[PDB]
């Protein structure tokens, strides 16, 4: 009997090695053999498709197939790749569209990846981080004024379908061109736009927008469109996070957009239900919060010991009928450092972007907002929070106090001021001046409907005539009293000659 045990041990120790598929369906395969396979190892199947060995049972290895699981069939040989679940990473990924495994799908040549990076590395510890200190200028007046995003922050864009989320993220990516052109790694921002479950046409349009705006010199797209199985839609955000982390730990600043993490949650639900893991709330597994937090928590502002790099997360959550109290939205809110709730009701009324003030907040902002922008925008958020209550109150009150009417007329101009067109990010140099126009009442003399023009035509005018203001804002980062006096002088000078749509004199 014990000699038996001993020779059994000989056999166990005896334990270039090939496994064989014994079961396959709907994206889950089981591979007998591969006694030395690591957990979450990347297994290779003959058709070129790859799987992730999640379960390592005593009899077989349960692998989630990433890609065409229809090519898998019983009896196929499965080969160890020898690499824990990992993606190639390097500077060659800039300007390239790659599926969640780093394989290019843009039709260009291969990618000269510097190395590989495991998708499941721990996020920076409590002692390896530092409070965010420099802003990530989104180029959106509403975000940069009321809910600023700092490098190293996780800001949650959240809203219903067709509510301006991808538009906000693409504007944020585009606005980084002025920083990229500087050539200074301490100011450059490299973007990674992980499209999870989006239509192929949407990703193509995003790439077109990034190319027209020059954003593909520094932006990488990790595309897992709706076509691809739940595997790619599941690990695409982690591929983007690995690509970004490689730059983050090299002392570079990164901006990772996840469009959308709701579609990754659905993909993980599919994978976990196909694995027969009992569902929890809303049919999700108990560890969906783990999925999203493990993900977003790696977006961090590293301490100066680790290079001082950063990775700014802009997850997008597609709520259903403004159900911000749903499971996945609440989870991601509990994970992130703020939320930009793009309301659909404002989105239909032409308020573009439809940022809902009050509910929208940047928890870590304020410390990551330039001095001039903080000075001008301090009153803006409170003013709009009041207005949007006064707007509803006025529609039914017979009459209002002159002060209340003044507040209403100021808010009706502030809202139009924050209204902004698509693919037209504004440098903070123009954002501070634009918010200065409205917050200080210079728009009071301008009719509401024309504010959008009066703003733009002024910004161009200064940019052509009084660029000293913008240069001062760039260099000093504060609207000094001298610059403020010059700016009000230019504002009055412009006003005289600014036409209105109705021809009225705005002076």
């Amino acid at each position: 009997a014990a000699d038996i045990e001993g020779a059994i041990e000989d056999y166990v120790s005896s334990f270039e090695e090939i496994g064989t598929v014994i079961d396959a369906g709907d994206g889950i395969a089981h591979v007998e053999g591969l006694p030395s396979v690591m957990t979450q190892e990347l297994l290779e199947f003959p058709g070129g498709v790859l799987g992730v060995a999640l379960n390592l049972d005593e009899h077989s290895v349960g692998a989630v197939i990433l890609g065409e699981f229809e090519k898998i069939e019983e009896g196929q040989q499965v080969k160890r790749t020898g690499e824990v679940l990992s993606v190639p990473v390097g500077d060659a990924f800039l300007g390239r569209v790659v599926n969640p495994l780093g394989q290019p799908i843009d039709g260009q040549g291969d990618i000269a990846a510097e190395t590989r990076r495991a998708l499941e590395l721990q996020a920076p510890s409590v002692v390896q981080r530092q409070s965010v200190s420099e802003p990530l200028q989104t180029g959106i007046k509403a975000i940069d004024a009321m809910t600023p995003i700092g490098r190293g922050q996780r800001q949650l864009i959240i809203g219903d379908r067709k509510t301006g989320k991808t538009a906000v993220c693409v504007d944020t990516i585009l606005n980084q061109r002025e920083a990229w052109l500087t050539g200074d790694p301490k100011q450059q921002v490299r973007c990674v736009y992980v499209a999870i479950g989006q239509k192929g046409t949407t990703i193509a349009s995003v790439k077109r927008a990034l190319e027209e705006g020059g954003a593909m010199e520094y932006t990488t797209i990790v595309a897992a469109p709706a076509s691809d199985a739940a595997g790619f839609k599941w690990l695409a955000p982690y591929t983007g996070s690995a690509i970004g982390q490689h730059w983050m730990y090299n002392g570079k600043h990164v901006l990772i957009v996840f469009d959308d993490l709701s579609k990754q949650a659905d993909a993980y639900r599919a994978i976990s239900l196909l694995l027969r893991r009992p569902p929890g709330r809303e049919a999700f597994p108990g560890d969906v919060f783990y999925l999203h937090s493990r993900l977003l928590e790696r977006c961090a502002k590293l301490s100066d010991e680790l290079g001082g790099g950063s990775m700014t997360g802009l997850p997008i959550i597609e709520t259903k009928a403004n159900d911000i109290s749903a499971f996945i939205p609440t989870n991601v809110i509990s994970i992130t450092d703020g939320q930009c709730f793009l309301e659909s009701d404002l989105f239909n009324q032409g308020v573009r972007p439809a940022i809902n003030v009050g509910v929208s907040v940047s928890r870590v902002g304020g410390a990551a907002q330039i001095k001039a922008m903080k000075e001008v925008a301090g009153s803006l958020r409170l003013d709009l929070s009041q207005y949007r209550e006064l707007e509803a109150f006025a529609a039914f009150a017979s009459d209002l106090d002159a002060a209340s009417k003044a507040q209403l007329d100021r808010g009706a101009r502030l809202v139009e001021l924050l209204k902004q067109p698509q693919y037209s990010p504004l440098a903070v140099e123009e954002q501070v001046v634009a918010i200065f126009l409205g917050t200080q009442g210079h728009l009071d003399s301008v009719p509401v409907e024309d504010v959008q023009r009066f703003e733009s035509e002024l910004l161009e005018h200064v940019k052509a005539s009084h660029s000293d203001i913008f240069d001062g804002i760039r260099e000093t980062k504060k609207l000094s009293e001298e610059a403020e006096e010059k700016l009000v002088s230019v504002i009055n000078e412009f006003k005289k000659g600014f036409q209105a749509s109705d021809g009225s004199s705005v002076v």
Binding site: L56, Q122, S125, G280, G286, R294, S325, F327, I333, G358
Partner: protein, 464 residues
């Protein structure tokens, strides 16, 4: 002798030992991941005995790169954490390993993180109020010194801000020692708290333990016990008065649910582990204060999907002396600290403890707010105008009472820019007594937002 890994299912590892050397429950086992990119000394904790010398264990570090067949050695003792005055002023992970300097604490006295709670003979109820300087808490949810306190809330209502606020109110001038347990919260907030306590000089008197989000469920559920071991050492051995903040205690049950689904245990009502009550009680029955040595505890509880009927909040309600239930509706009004005056409660709000002047005012305020909640339907459809005159006056002062419960918290300075204010309990009682009697029905309602006091209320009323 050593065992052998047989099954790996996410953070759960089955290990087969020889015939008689099977380890005890909760024993700490060690395995090795040798893959170069992420090689590490994996720590496992025995959770079940499956027969045939197999034992199923919960991994503390993520189980990636682990290979079937790797030798597993059992330490023969449960997970141990350092204890002593030394742990104060340092940051530890769930396993007692220091972070701000990794060489720290491996020579201190080590305590097993698993223990039975104090005997029933040593327990006695705590009925001493803890003035926090907040009007809502000091009036309607008076906290208990040496008693368990909970801050319930969904995502974004202000639980963490309240925890650091009460660190400002209580810990910053506390005579004894403090402990903070980051369970499933942001590493960003952990770092922020670390720097804040360093700046306030409260760091030297507090031991921080972190099991933050990025860690697997094992550490995310054992970090609470790791911090509670240091708290219990400061309680039983040093005799110091202890504070124990835990943010967030729902993450402990969430990690419990994950490990339960991985261990093969059948799911409970809404997918939680069947032993939710058992594990939750084992944790929070060690946070109790004994007869001669107090351990004040303040636990942020996350309420998923804003559903207060979720089994985790439902179970953790029974283990509290004071509960402060933050609500989304109050938060949307901007009424911070965002407490629901009606859903919150305290076990010392009886007139034998807080006095009848306090109790009568608190009950009148609760009555006014309950009548307001009852009329909410007519308010929503028709408005205040169609109520009876009695109810109209009641609603007009109910709104003012509701707004006056808001306060410019110290921790709010980073958001609002305004400095924070502290209202003594006597002033709160007098102010709310005046409010319920109608002595302030003429001032505008906005004069009560984030005001924190009668004198400052008069100041703001003059301002408007």
């Amino acid at each position: 002798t050593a065992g052998r890994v047989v099954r790996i299912t996410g953070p759960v590892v089955d290990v087969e030992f020889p015939r008689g050397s099977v380890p005890e429950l909760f024993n700490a086992l060690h395995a090795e991941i040798t893959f170069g990119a992420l090689a590490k000394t994996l720590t496992l904790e025995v959770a079940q005995h499956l027969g045939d010398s197999l034992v199923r264990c919960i991994s503390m570090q993520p189980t990636d790169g682990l290979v079937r067949g790797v030798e597993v050695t059992d330490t023969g003792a449960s997970i141990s954490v350092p204890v002593g005055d030394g742990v104060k002023g340092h940051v530890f992970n769930a396993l007692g390993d220091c972070l701000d300097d990794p060489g720290y604490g491996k020579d201190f006295e080590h305590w097993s993180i698993h223990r039975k709670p104090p005997a029933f003979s040593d327990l006695e109820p705590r009925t001493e109020m803890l003035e926090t300087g907040l009007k809502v808490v000091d009036l309607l949810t008076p906290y208990v010194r040496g008693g368990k306190i909970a801050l319930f809330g969904g995502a974004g209502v202000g639980k963490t801000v309240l925890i650091q606020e009460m660190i400002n109110r209580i810990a910053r001038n506390f005579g004894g020692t403090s402990v903070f347990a980051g369970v499933g919260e942001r590493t960003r907030e952990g770092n922020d708290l670390w720097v804040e306590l360093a700046d306030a000089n409260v760091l030297k008197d507090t031991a921080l333990v972190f099991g933050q989000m990025d860690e697997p469920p094992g550490t995310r559920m054992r970090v609470a016990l790791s911090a509670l071991t240091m708290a219990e050492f400061f309680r039983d051995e040093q005799g110091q008065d202890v504070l124990l903040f835990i943010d967030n205690i729902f993450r402990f049950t969430q990690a419990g649910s994950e490990v339960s689904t991985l261990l093969g245990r059948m799911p409970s009502a809404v997918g939680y582990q069947p032993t939710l009550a058992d594990e939750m009680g084992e944790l929070q029955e060690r946070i109790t204060s004994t007869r001669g040595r107090s351990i004040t505890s303040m636990q942020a509880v996350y309420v998923p999907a804003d559903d207060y009927t979720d089994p985790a909040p439902a179970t953790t309600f029974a283990h509290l002396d004071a509960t402060t239930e933050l609500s989304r509706a109050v938060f949307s009004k901007g009424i911070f600290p965002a407490v629901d005056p009606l859903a919150s409660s305290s076990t010392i709000l009886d007139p034998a403890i807080v006095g009848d002047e306090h109790y009568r005012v608190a009950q009148e305020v609760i009555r006014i707010l309950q009548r307001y909640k009852d009329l909410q339907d007519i308010i929503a459809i028709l408005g205040i105008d169609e109520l009876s005159e009695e109810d109209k006056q009641l609603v007009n002062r109910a709104r003012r009472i509701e707004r006056f419960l808001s306060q410019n918290m110290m921790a709010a300075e980073q958001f609002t820019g305004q400095p924070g204010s502290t209202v003594p309990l006597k002033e709160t009682i007098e102010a709310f007594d005046k409010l319920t009697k109608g002595e302030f029905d003429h001032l505008p309602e906005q004069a009560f937002f984030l005001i924190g006091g009668l004198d400052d209320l008069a100041k703001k009323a003059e301002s408007l």
